[PDB]
Design a protein around this nucleic acid. Structure first.
Lengths: 261, 220
RNA sequence: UUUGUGGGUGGUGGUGCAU
């Protein structure tokens, strides 16, 4: 029941930034980061129907100007809707690189990417295509290592999903620092994955594909110095009961011939 | 008629893009001039105001507490690295054939120590330094001091003279294959200094130090 | 986030063909 001038102005600037694909931005939209009420503003603008360059410039604006929790709510709502929108509108499931750039700015802003986009995506169950897409973004662009290893620790605490293991493969190959408490988290993930020869589990017995196998290889490859020796022979038991065909003995050689702290 | 048709098509294209971009320009400017300030003022008259993030903050604190790294890319096969090196040797061969056809501070520190372990003192100084310009300037005054000590004494025997000089010479090798321009201008003006000394007196400035200067440059 | 010092580079690849 808001004022009619706000209604008309924001839906008509919504149509303006629908018909936009080239050019510049309004006085209204560049004084929107001079205010606070962005949720109400952009909810009267109705954001989810604009153009790729438009979501590009909105992300450039909010990442360049605003701060953490505003970035959280903005990136969750807007980028999740636009990301799903772009992928399930493209029939071969391709993302527009300007929306990829929006994701890149979301990474670049420090506490914007994990609070807003990636973790509600893990809750809402994206497909493996979107998983590989955000993994390639995480490969090219880099947040602070603290926040990156934070994403690692929380995704290893959160349950298994194929997006979960693809993302954790992307991080373990992204090759940041792995603290010993984080390898506590990661081998806790691994002891919820292995077989408990008394209470078995679905995550402890289910089917675990080959991208997870590459993740196991890069974990025991790079990070053999932080797995403590009980975690070492626990990885021995894990890989021997759930080994592979050509990746597994490489994991075993890396695992035994690794010394640690 | 086909060519004219294609051109008519392009004309239609340019006309469409110009008119539509003009329309969007008009509308955006209109709203930006009236309804912009309207919306700003009136929405300002209005208003608009955890396991994941908790784990994020906690594991960031964890990261700060305990970062840890050890880089390791994929290992290299025997024949792979060996043939790459053999080919690099071939490239070196080709480059060689194609080329064929077409101080007191250092003194004080080291002599304050002792030569017979100043080999080690210097290697350590270099180790600390290597963990650009530091390296270059020290290498230059190192070669100077090498000349100096070799012209200062020849008392020691094959056991303690040769080993010091040859380990130093290996250091010279590796520092040469890394940095060279400092060495080059050092030895250039070194030729200047020794030719001026010859011109002062022909034989009263030549010695085993300048002879081994010839030797070390000729093997470097 | 950037700086003083080392360094990763081909596929948001086309692609037949058989299931």
């Amino acid at each position: 029941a808001l004022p009619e001038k706000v209604i008309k102005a924001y839906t008509t600037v919504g149509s303006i930034l629908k018909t936009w694909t080239h050019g510049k931005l309004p006085k209204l939209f560049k004084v929107i980061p001079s205010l606070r009420n962005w949720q109400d503003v952009i909810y009267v603008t109705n954001p989810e129907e604009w153009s790729p360059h438009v979501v590009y410039e909105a992300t450039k604006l909010f990442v360049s100007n605003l701060t953490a929790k505003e970035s959280q709510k903005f990136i969750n709502l807007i980028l999740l809707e636009r990301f799903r929108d772009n992928i399930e509108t493209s029939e071969d499931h391709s993302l527009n690189y300007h929306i990829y750039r929006a994701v890149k700015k979301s990474l670049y802003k420090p506490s914007a990417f994990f609070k807003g986009f990636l973790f509600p995506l893990v809750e809402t169950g994206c497909n493996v295509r979107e998983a590989t897409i955000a993994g390639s973004v995480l490969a090219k662009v880099s947040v602070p290592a603290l926040h990156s290893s934070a994403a690692l620790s929380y995704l290893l605490r959160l349950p298994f999903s194929p997006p979960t293991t693809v993302f954790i493969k992307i991080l373990l190959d992204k090759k940041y620092a792995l603290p010993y408490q984080t390898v506590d988290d990661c081998v806790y993930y691994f002891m919820r994955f292995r077989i408990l020869d008394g209470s078995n589990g679905e995550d402890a017995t289910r089917v675990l594909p080959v991208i997870w196998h590459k993740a196991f290889l890069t974990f025991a490859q790079r990070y053999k110095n932080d797995i403590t020796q009980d975690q070492r022979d626990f990885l021995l038991e894990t890989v021997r009961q759930r080994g592979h065909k050509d990746i597994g003995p490489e994991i075993r050689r890396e695992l035994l011939a690794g010394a640690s702290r | 008629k086909k060519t004219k048709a294609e051109v008519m098509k392009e004309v239609i294209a340019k006309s469409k893009f110009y008119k539509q971009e003009r329309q969007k320009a008009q509308g955006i400017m209109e709203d930006q001039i009236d309804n912009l300030d309207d919306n700003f003022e009136d929405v300002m008259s209005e208003l608009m105001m955890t396991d994941l993030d908790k784990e994020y903050d906690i594991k960031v604190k964890e990261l700060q507490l305990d970062k840890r790294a050890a880089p390791s890319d994929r290992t290299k096969t025997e024949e792979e690295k060996n043939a790459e090196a053999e080919e690099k040797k071939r490239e070196l061969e080709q480059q060689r054939l194609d080329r064929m056809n077409g101080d007191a501070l250092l003194d004080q520190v080291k002599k304050l120590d002792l030569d017979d372990h100043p080999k080690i003192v210097k290697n350590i100084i270099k180790a600390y330094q290597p963990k650009k310009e530091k390296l270059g300037k020290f290498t230059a005054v190192l070669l100077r001091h090498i000349i100096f000590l070799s012209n200062q004494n020849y008392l020691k025997n094959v056991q303690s003279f040769k080993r010091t000089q040859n380990a130093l010479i290996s250091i010279l090798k590796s520092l040469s294959e890394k940095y060279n321009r400092e060495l080059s201008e050092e030895c250039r003006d070194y030729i200047n200094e020794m030719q001026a000394r010859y011109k002062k007196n022909h034989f009263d400035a030549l010695s085993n130090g300048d002879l081994v200067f010839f030797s070390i440059i000729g093997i470097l």
